[PDB]
Design a protein around this ligand. Structure first.
Ligand SMILES: Nc1ncnc2c1ncn2[C@@H]1O[C@H](COP(=O)(O)OP(=O)(O)OP(=O)(O)O)[C@@H](O)[C@H]1O
Ligand SMILES: Nc1ncnc2c1ncn2[C@@H]1O[C@H](COP(=O)(O)OP(=O)(O)OP(=O)(O)O)[C@@H](O)[C@H]1O
Ligand SMILES: Nc1ncnc2c1ncn2[C@@H]1O[C@H](COP(=O)(O)OP(=O)(O)OP(=O)(O)O)[C@@H](O)[C@H]1O
Ligand SMILES: [Mg+2]
Ligand SMILES: [Mg+2]
Ligand SMILES: [Mg+2]
Lengths: 247, 247, 247, 61
C-alpha cells in the first residue's frame, strides 16, 4: 500500500519524524485547504523542529555541563550588583565574535556559575560548540593525558571547542606542573576562542594558587589582553534561601 | 519567508535532491490536484531512488574494480561450454546465502573474469559488499600489512567484504611466505563469506604454485569444501576479436 | 639602470632565451616600427620554439635511444614488402589512440628496428613519451628490482611511458622466471599503453623462447588483442650495403 | 612419511610439540608431522638435573 511504503522510505531517510508529521499534516490538510506547497512547508517545519531538538539533545550529551539553567531563570532584583545591560550584551554573544574572554569574580554563593551556564546553553542552542570542565578535573585530565601519552589528543579536543568554561578556579591550589598545563591550555586558546571562567580569588592570589609568580603573570596577561571581568558582590543566595525556608 | 526556509530545511536534512525534487512534484501535484499521500509518496520515491543510485556509485568507487562490465554484454553462443542455466543461477546470488565459493578455470582468453566481475557488480548493486583484487596485489597487500604492523586492519578489510574476488591466481608463482599469507586469508574466509576466484592452472599445479605441497592441499580442501567451479574451455575472446577485426 | 634590470627580470622569470629574443626583436621593430602585439608575439613564439626544442632534446637524452633515425632516411624501394601506405599510417600514430600494439617480424637486416626507432622519435617530437629497451636488459632490470625490493618502482617507470619499444625479443632465450617478469610488464600494459616490439621468431617459437607454453599463449593473446603486425621479408640491408661497398 | 607405519623412528628433542611450528617455520606442516608421528608414538618426558653437570660437580668434589 501507500502508507507502509511511505514509512519505509521515511525511515530509510532517517525520518520517523517524517512518518509522524506526514500523518498529522495530511490529516490537517484533508480537514482544511492547504496548497501542496504549504503542506510541504509544514512537513519540513515539523521535520526540522524535531531534528533541531534531537541535535540540541545530542550536543548536550556531548557537552559536560554541570546542570541546565537559563538566564531568564536568573533574577536581578535579588542581585542588584549585576547589570541587565551587560548581561544581555553577553547573551547576544557578540563577545565571542570579538574573541573576548569572560571572567566572574566574587565571594561564593552569588550565582556567577548560573550566568556562565546560561551563556553556554544559549551558545549550544545557537549552534556554537560549548564545553565545560572544572579546574581540578581539567588539571587531572591534562596530567593523565601526559602520563598516558594522549596529551596531544586531549589538547586538541580542548582547543577545538568554540567555547570552553573553566570552573572552580581558586578553590583548589595548583602546583607548578598544573600551572604549566593550564598555561599550555591558555596559550593554545590565546586569541583563538573565548574562555568563560569563574573564580573566588583576586588576580594577585593566582600567584600562590599556581605556585609560580611568573606563570601567573603570563597567564593573566594573555587572558586579560581581551577579556571582560564581572566583580559581583552581595549575599550568598544559598544561605538566603535557607533562611527563607526557615522562615 | 517560505521558499528560503524550505531550502534551509531540505539542506539540513542533507537532501538538496529532495529540495529540487519537491519543487517538480509539488508543481505536478498543483497541476493535477494529487492527494497529499501520493505527493509524499512521489517525494520519497524519487529521493530514495537518487539516494540508492548515489550509494551504488559510492560503493563502486570504494571497491577497486578494474572495470565495469555486466553479463548483458556476454556471448553464450560462441562459448558452448558455459550453460545459461548456471550463469543465471549465479546471477541470482544464491551462492551468498548458501556460502558457496565460485571458481573459474581455463586457459587464457576465455573470459572467466567477465562473469565474475558481472556477479560482483550485481552483488554491489543489490547491497552486498564485494571487493576485487589480484593474487599478486593481494599478496603484496598482505606482506606490506605484516611489515607495517597493520596486518589485522588489512585482514579485516579483506575478510569483511561479503565477496572477495581473487584474480590472476596461477600466472604468477608464489613463495611459501605468500603461500602462508594466502592461507591466512582463506582460513579467515573459510566458512564466513564466499570467495570468487579465477585461474588457469589445474588444482594439482597449485602445489608448485605455492612452493609447498601440504599448504596447497590444505588450501584446496578449505576452498573446495563448499565450492562450485566452472571449468571453461574454448577459443580466446581476444584472438577471436583480433581475427574479426582482421576480416 | 634599465638593461641590467631587464636581464635580471628575464632570468627571474626563467627566460634568458626571451632575454636574447627581445635583444633581436627590439632592433627588428626599430627597423620597421612593428606593433607592440606583434613584437610580444615574436618574443613569445621564439621563446616557445627554443623551450620546445630543448625539451625535445631532453626527452631524447632521457630515453635510452641508441641512435637517431627518421623514416625519411629510409628507402622503401629496396624493400618491396613494406607498403608506404601502412608505414605512413603508423607514422600518423593512430594506433596510440586505439591502443594497438605494433609488432615487426622478419629475418635480420631488413630494418624493422629502424621503423621502431623512427616511431619513437616521432613520439618524442609530438610529446608522446617513449622508452626503448632490449628484452635482455628489461629482464635483467626486472630481476634486479625483485632482488632489491624496488619492483614497484621499476614497474612504474617502465609502465608510465606512453610507448614501450621492446627490442631483440627472440635472439636470447628466456627462462620461466624471466617469462613471468615479461608477463608482469605486459599485463601492466595490457590495455593502458601501446607496445612496439621487434622479433625474428614466429609466435609458435615463443613457447620455447620463454620456457612456458601457457605463459607464451597468454602474452601473445594480450599483445595481439589490439595490434597490427608487420611480417617483413626480403634481403638483408646490411648484406646489400656490404655488397655495394665491395663493388 | 616414508618411515610412517613402515619402520620405527627414535627421536630426541627438547621442545614441546607445539613449538615445532616455529622450529620448522610452517605451522601446518609441523602439525601434519606431529599428527602422523603421534599416530604410532610413545612419549618420554624426562625431567632432572643434567647428568653432565652432576658428573662435573662430583669430579670437582
Ligand atoms: N538570581 C538567582 N536566582 C535564583 N537562584 C540564584 C540566583 N543567584 C544565585 N542563585 C542560587 O545560587 C546557587 C548557584 O550558585 P553558583 O554556583 O552559580 O555560584 P557561585 O558563587 O559560583 O558558587 P560556589 O559556591 O559553587 O563557588 C543556586 O542555589 C542558585 O539557586
Ligand atoms: N563471452 C564474452 N562476451 C563478451 N566479452 C567477452 C567474453 N569473453 C571474454 N570477453 C572479454 O574479452 C576480454 C578478454 O577476456 P578476459 O581477459 O576477461 O578473459 P580471461 O581468460 O580471464 O583472461 P586472462 O587469463 O588473459 O587474463 C575481456 O574484455 C573480457 O571482458
Ligand atoms: N630502407 C633502408 N634505408 C636505409 N637504411 C636502412 C634501410 N633498412 C635498413 N637500414 C639500415 O640497416 C641497418 C639495419 O637496420 P636494423 O638493425 O634496424 O635491422 P633489423 O632487421 O631489425 O636487424 P636485426 O634483426 O639484425 O637486429 C641499420 O643501419 C638501418 O639503418
Ligand atoms: Mg560556582
Ligand atoms: Mg582472467
Ligand atoms: Mg632488430
Amino acid at each position: 500500500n501507500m502508507k507502509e511504503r511511505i514509512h519505509e522510505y521515511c525511515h530509510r531517510l532517517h525520518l520517523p519524524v517524517m512518518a509522524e508529521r506526514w500523518s498529522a499534516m495530511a490529516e490537517y490538510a484533508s480537514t482544511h485547504n492547504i496548497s501542496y506547497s504549504e503542506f510541504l512547508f509544514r512537513l519540513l517545519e515539523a521535520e526540522i523542529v524535531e531534528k533541531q531538538a534531537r541535535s540540541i539533545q545530542t550536543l548536550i550529551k556531548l557537552s559536560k555541563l554541570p546542570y541546565r539553567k537559563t538566564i531568564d531563570t536568573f533574577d536581578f532584583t535579588a542581585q542588584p550588583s549585576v547589570d541587565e545591560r551587560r548581561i544581555r550584551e553577553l547573551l547576544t554573544l557578540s563577545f565571542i565574535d570579538r574573541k573576548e574572554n569572560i571572567l566572574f569574580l566574587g565571594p561564593p554563593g552569588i550565582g556567577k556559575t548560573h550566568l556562565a551556564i546560561s551563556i553556554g546553553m544559549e551558545a549550544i542552542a545557537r549552534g556554537y560548540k560549548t564545553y565545560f570542565i572544572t579546574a581540578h578535573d581539567l588539571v587531572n585530565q591534562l596530567r593523565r593525558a601526559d602520563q598516558e601519552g594522549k596529551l596531544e589528543k586531549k589538547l586538541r579536543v580542548f582547543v577545538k571547542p568554540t567555547v570552553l568554561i573553566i570552573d572552580q578556579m581558586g578553590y583548589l591550589k595548583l602546583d607548578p606542573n598544573s600551572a604549566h598545563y593550564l598555561f599550555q591550555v591558555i596559550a593554545r586558546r590565546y586569541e583563538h576562542a573565548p574562555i568563560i571562567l569563574t573564580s573566588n580569588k583576586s588576580f594577585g592570589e593566582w600567584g600562590e594558587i599556581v605556585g609560580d609568580s611568573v606563570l601567573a603573570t603570563a597567564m593573566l596577561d594573555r587572558l586579560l589582553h581581551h577579556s571582560i571581568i564581572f566583580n559581583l558582590k552581595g549575599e550568598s543566595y544559598r544561605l538566603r534561601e535557607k533562611r527563607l525556608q526557615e522562615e
